């Protein structure tokens, strides 16, 4: 019987991983706590105040890709997964149920 | 590339046990804790950076054990024959046995303590589902074999 023959394993960002606790639930837990926007600061600083959280979260979730590439993959997988669509509409369904 | 293999008159699991038993047992009682555990306590307090192993002590330990009737496998002859390996064995015995410090040393300024503490915190988070190092990194002392005196 067959003694082993090799193959190359691979990993990428995926909707299940993006739906794990360290994915979007981490955002719902931490984003409103960590981002703060104020009229007391210029636009560049406020934009950075948004971006710093999402960049650190994106790295800690999936350290392979650059932040811009991460955003592109997030947009495309968001465009093309039913589970992620269900979760996303479920957030606003919950807000509608408030 | 395969290799043949042979049997030899040595067993390092056994000699490791012999070494650690020596290390926790011996003292120079004729001069009236165990000598080496006291020296390791001095290492723990970072007052001493060298461990000097005496082959005279291993001889007297062998003589005591042989007087008590057990065989002792002549560790002196073994570690005169292949001393390089036995530095590693003695350091493993020390890195197991070495006690905690009795005196405080302002520990927070030690880089290797800080870096391995940060590693341990991260590994606790990993192990909470949210060796630790190569041993030489944590081994501050240096170990030396002192020869047999002529007698």
């Amino acid at each position: 019987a067959i003694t082993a023959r090799k193959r190359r394993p691979q990993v990428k960002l995926t909707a299940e991983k993006l739906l794990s606790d360290k994915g979007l639930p981490y955002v719902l837990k931490n984003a409103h706590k960590r981002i703060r926007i104020s009229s007391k600061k210029n636009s560049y600083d406020n934009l950075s105040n948004i971006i710093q959280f999402y960049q650190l979260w994106a790295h800690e979730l999936f350290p392979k890709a650059k932040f811009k590439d991460f955003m592109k993959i997030c947009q495309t997988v968001g465009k093309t997964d039913p589970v992620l669509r269900e979760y996303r509409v479920s957030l606003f369904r919950d807000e509608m149920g408030m | 590339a395969a290799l043949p293999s042979i049997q030899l008159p040595v067993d390092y699991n056994n000699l490791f046990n012999e070494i650690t038993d020596f290390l926790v047992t011996f003292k120079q009682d004729t001069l009236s804790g165990p000598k080496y555990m006291a020296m390791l306590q001095k290492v723990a307090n970072r007052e001493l950076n060298s461990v000097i192993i005496d082959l005279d002590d291993i001889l007297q330990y062998q003589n005591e054990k042989f007087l008590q009737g057990t065989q002792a496998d002549d560790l002196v002859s073994a570690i005169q024959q292949n001393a390089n390996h036995f530095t590693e064995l003695f350091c493993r015995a020390i890195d197991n046995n070495m006690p905690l410090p009795t005196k405080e040393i302002d520990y927070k300024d030690d880089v290797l303590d800080v870096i391995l503490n940060q590693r341990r915190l991260r590994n606790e988070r990993m192990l909470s589902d949210r060796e630790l190092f190569p041993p030489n990194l944590t081994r501050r002392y240096f170990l030396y074999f002192k020869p047999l005196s002529q007698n």
């Binding site: 003694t3 082993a4 | 043949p4 042979i6 049997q7 008159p9």
Partner: protein, 320 residues
């Protein structure tokens, strides 16, 4: 309805079974870090199980019932046992089982191969008495091993005296034994060696007297078989007239001198049927060409470049 089941657990990711006849469990020892059928094998019975083959698994440390082969008592009628590279097993615990139960009415073949060098095992011939006013414990080595045709102990750290005692006690039957593999056993020394501890000696003269009708010997990786030690085989040629197939390959010591004079005295018996000396760096090419030319062996293999011996399926069920 399943009679023969095989599982080859190539990777890891995170009651009565009368039907069964052959269970083959093979594992990638690097990837598999436990023992799959542990609960099933110890709890259940497989009463018609003819052959069992477990390789590459790792026995748990937390369970002396596993380590002492206590489960293995579950399977009478077990015509063959093969067990190989089971990293936390020991031949010592196995022989302790064999001491204290008539565990098997019949083994036609036994094959045990632990991987790492556990300490010396001697045949534990101690027959204790609870009191001399009470029976000595009947030692079941004879009736357990009396049936064997094939005994294979490659790599198992058995001492040479242990095997002689198996023959002097006639626990190994001889009249039924046909193939013996003791390769890669570092605790074997032959009588001509001046350097030893006496209980590592193999008395090949006694052994070959006992079990003379055997066909197939394997001494591969038996580095202790230097040219001087081969002289013991030369003088014991009269006791191995049944021998057809001789594997002594991957011996880095054995010069072509011993090979040649062994085949020459064997020729005083008609060639030896088959001989394997792959990887033996010291057999001179002209000598083995003489062996072919003068036709002292019907087939002889001299693939000097063959680094390893474990042909999967043929020689071993350890995975890859």
């Amino acid at each position: 309805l399943l009679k023969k089941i095989e599982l080859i657990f190539v990777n890891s990711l995170v009651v009565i079974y009368s039907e069964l006849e052959k269970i083959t469990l093979i594992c990638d020892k690097k990837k598999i870090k436990n023992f799959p059928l542990c609960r099933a094998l110890l709890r259940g019975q497989f009463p018609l199980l003819q052959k069992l083959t477990i390789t590459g698994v790792t026995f748990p440390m937390n369970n002396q019932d596993i380590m002492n082969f206590q489960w293995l008592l579950n399977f009478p009628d077990l015509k063959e046992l093969w067990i190989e590279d089971n990293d936390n097993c020991e031949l010592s615990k196995f022989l302790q089982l064999l001491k204290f139960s008539n565990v098997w009415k019949n083994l036609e073949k036994l094959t045990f191969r632990e991987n790492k060098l556990y300490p010396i095992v001697n045949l534990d011939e101690d027959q204790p008495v609870t009191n001399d006013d009470e029976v000595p414990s009947m030692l079941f080595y004879k009736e357990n091993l009396q049936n064997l045709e094939k005994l294979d102990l490659m790599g198992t750290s058995i001492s040479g005296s242990a095997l002689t005692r198996l023959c002097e006690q006639e626990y190994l039957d001889g009249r039924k034994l046909r193939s013996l593999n003791i390769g890669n056993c570092p605790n074997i020394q032959f009588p001509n060696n001046h350097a030893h501890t006496a209980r590592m000696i193999l008395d090949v003269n006694a052994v070959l007297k006992r079990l003379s009708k055997l066909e197939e010997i394997n001494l591969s990786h038996l580095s202790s078989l230097n040219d001087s030690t081969m002289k013991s085989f030369i003088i014991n040629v009269p006791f191995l007239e049944n021998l057809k197939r001789l594997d002594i390959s991957h011996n880095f010591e054995i010069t072509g001198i011993s090979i040649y004079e062994f085949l020459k005295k064997f020729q005083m018996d008609q060639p030896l049927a088959y001989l394997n000396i792959d990887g033996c760096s010291q057999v001179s090419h002209i000598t083995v060409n003489m062996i072919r030319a003068q036709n002292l062996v019907t087939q002889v293999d001299c693939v000097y470049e063959r680094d390893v011996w474990r042909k999967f399926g043929i020689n071993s069920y350890s995975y890859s």
